[PDB]
Amino acid sequence: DIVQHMEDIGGAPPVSCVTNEILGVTCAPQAIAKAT
């Protein structure tokens, strides 16, 4: 399973926003690249 392999080497959660204490909510202005 490719997802297990990715997770194993630190593959990240598929996320669009982050909260930062100084800027608040922070999001991707355009769709993030996905797969093949």
By CB under 8 A, name the binding residues for another protein.
Answer: 2, 5-13, 15-36
Let me know: does 26 contact 20? Beta carbons within 8 Å.
yes
Question: Could you tell me the smallest distance in angstroms from the CB atom of residue 33 to another protein?
Answer: 4
Report d(CA 23, CA 29) in Å as an integer. 15
Question: Could you tell me the smallest distance in angstroms from the CB atom of residue 10 to another protein?
Answer: 4
Let me know: does 1 contact 11? Beta carbons within 8 Å.
no
Question: Could you tell me the smallest distance in angstroms from the CB atom of residue 1 to another protein?
Answer: 12
